[PDB]
């Protein structure tokens, strides 16, 4: 019995291996039931002679037995490929591999890419001492898995804590000051981040037309600021969360792709960040640089929460119910305030998809050397906390509020929001009309629903079935 660690890089389809078989004789039709099969990669040689005797009658043939397939007790059966953990491989050295054999409830406990520890019997394949070159006496090795542990549920105590956390008067302020506490400034940024982390309400109308509750946030800013740090924190803080760039990741894409395997003809779908973080948050860093097909795809991944792929094989509509937290720089690098809105070259259709856009500037005020001192303390006191929520509890609370409560606007809240929306639409139209340029940032019904979503998120932090006028 060995215990080894590793990463799983292949997982075969679950198949059927017999634990008990029954064989029937071709002539006398008598059966030889419930023969026990050896577990693992071990075979069975059928008896070469029928048991039944009747001296008056002639004998059965030499090899008379045939597996009766319906009288067979089969169990689930999977073969895995374990690679040596990348941190365990010696320096100039190829990784080692190990074949694993799973059984009956160890099947599908792991997926390729999991880091696992295995307990199992270090065994050889016993398929008959046949299949004969150079290596003699060598039989293929595998581990017969007896236990799988994947290296990485709201108990009523946790639930009671979540209820009393929502019931706090200043739950919004606790959450807001608890998200990126080690980042100086950006208080409204952090409040918006909290709202994105909870999200609004996803609605399906009677006509079948869905409406998203997921909030998309864009951070345009100067490169000094901590917005990549903010994306990193958010992807550690959300239950489902993926950090990527506009061009995807190293050996991962941004959106999904679909391909047919010419041999097996299966439709393989590569998971990009958008479909991997379904039900969660995608943090697209360096949003401004992105390949054109990805832009066209995130047009409707950000609004319809789907990715429609159609190959000559098939047509699919993958789910991407994900919030988008995006960060980008100005087209000139720095904001260059005199350039108005000519320093962002995002098309209006992409900016429309975003609920809130934050422009972030490094002001050159001298008293913001408290910000330097703040960094120095953070790097001092780092190795060794206020009244707030640690990361794990925040993750659990966000997941809990997302699954339990979906708020709706109250009537008077809706009235107030309608009037405010009309006011700001008139203001934006007037600002366009007065200025000699169409506004690069639009205010549309999509922004009305954005404010509805932010109000619903605020109400959801408090587990409130209806969103008041306060959170509107």
């Amino acid at each position: 019995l060995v215990k080894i660690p590793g990463i799983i890089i292949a997982a075969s389809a679950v198949r059927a291996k017999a634990t008990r078989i029954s064989i029937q004789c071709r002539s006398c039709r008598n059966t030889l039931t419930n023969i026990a099969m050896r577990p693992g990669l071990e075979g069975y040689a059928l008896p070469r002679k029928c048991n039944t005797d009747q001296a008056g009658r002639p004998k059965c043939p030499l090899d008379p037995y045939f597996i009766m397939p319906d009288k067979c007790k089969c169990v689930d059966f999977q073969t895995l490929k374990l690679q040596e953990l990348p941190d365990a491989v010696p320096h100039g050295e190829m990784p080692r591999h190990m074949q694993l054999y799973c059984d009956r409830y160890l099947c599908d406990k792991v997926v390729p890419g999991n880091r696992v520890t295995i307990m199992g019997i270090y065994s050889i394949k016993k398929f008959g001492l046949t299949t004969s070159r150079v290596g003699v006496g060598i039989r293929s090795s595998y581990i017969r898995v007896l236990g799988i542990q994947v290296d990485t549920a709201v108990s009523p105590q946790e639930e009671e804590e979540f209820r009393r956390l929502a019931a706090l008067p200043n739950v919004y302020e606790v959450i807001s000051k608890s998200i990126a506490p080690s980042i100086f400034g950006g208080t409204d940024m952090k409040k918006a981040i909290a709202c994105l982390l909870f999200g609004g309400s996803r609605k399906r109308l009677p006509d079948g037309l869905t409406r998203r509750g997921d909030i998309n946030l864009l951070m345009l800013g100067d490169p000094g600021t901590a917005k990549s740090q903010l994306l990193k924190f958010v992807e550690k803080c959300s239950p489902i969360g993926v950090y990527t760039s506009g061009k995807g990741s190293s050996a991962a894409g941004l959106t999904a792709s679909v391909m047919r395997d010419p041999s097996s003809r299966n439709f393989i779908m590569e998971g990009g960040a958008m479909v991997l973080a379904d039900g969660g948050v995608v943090c697209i860093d360096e949003f401004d640089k992105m390949r054109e097909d990805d832009r066209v795809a995130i047009h409707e991944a950000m609004e319809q929460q789907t990715i429609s792929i159609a190959k000559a094989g098939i047509t699919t509509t993958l789910n991407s119910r994900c919030s988008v937290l995006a960060a980008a720089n100005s087209v000139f690098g720095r904001w260059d305030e005199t350039k108005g809105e000519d320093n962002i070259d995002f098309m209006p259709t992409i900016l429309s998809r975003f609920d809130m856009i934050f422009i972030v500037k490094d002001e050159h005020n001298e008293e913001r050397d408290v910000m330097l001192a703040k960094h120095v303390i953070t790097l001092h006191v780092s190795a060794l906390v206020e009244g707030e929520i640690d990361l794990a509890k925040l993750k659990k609370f966000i997941a809990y509020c997302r699954v339990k409560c979906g708020p709706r606007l109250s009537a008077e809240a809706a009235e107030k929001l309608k009037n405010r929306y009309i006011i700001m639409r008139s203001g934006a139209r007037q600002h366009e009309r007065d200025s000699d340029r169409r506004s690069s940032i639009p205010i549309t019904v999509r922004q009305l629903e954005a404010i509805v979503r932010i109000a619903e998120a605020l109400s959801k932090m408090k587990l409130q079935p209806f969103a008041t006028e306060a959170d509107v």
Partner: protein
Amino acid sequence: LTDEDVKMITSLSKDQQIGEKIFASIAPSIYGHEDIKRGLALALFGGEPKNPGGKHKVRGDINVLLCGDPGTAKSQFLKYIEKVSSRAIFTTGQGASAVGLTAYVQRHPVSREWTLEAGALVLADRGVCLIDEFDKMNDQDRTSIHEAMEQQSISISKAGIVTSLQARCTVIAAANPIGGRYDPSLTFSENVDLTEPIISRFDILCVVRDTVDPVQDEMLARF
């Protein structure tokens, strides 16, 4: 490769001039370039990683970018670092390397064995990745280096493998300027053919500027 006499190390530590001895002790077969030697020694020792709570990672790796016009010992510096460093691996922006920046999964050519061929950024997780000819990378290589050098991880989504696997390396890179000659009239960014996000993730940018100096030329020629 395990040390038994800390005593000599500590005695050298009290030398009160150990720093300059260390700096003079790197790339002994390269003449001059003392600022690059200070930077490379600093990177070779590295800073302190730290992660307040578990949510504010800051690396301690000192990434160094040597950008200099040709024939200025950049590749010799990278080879010295590969010799001295434990867990150093060498890679290039061209296709002329055993290991490549990007992770992929395939059947190994000599093993015939289905292997997650983790890239050169994760093969040097606790060490240093040396990228020669940094400005001549793919778009794929560029997003790979950007991910490893911002997140200190590499995210696979290839076969059925969805994994994230750690690349906490120090990146030491050598690049050439645009046009094969560094122009000090321009900024470093518009000299090098690297985007701003890639350059910002380096602590030390060594501009290896080549000029005709008869004394320095003579000393180098003698060397």
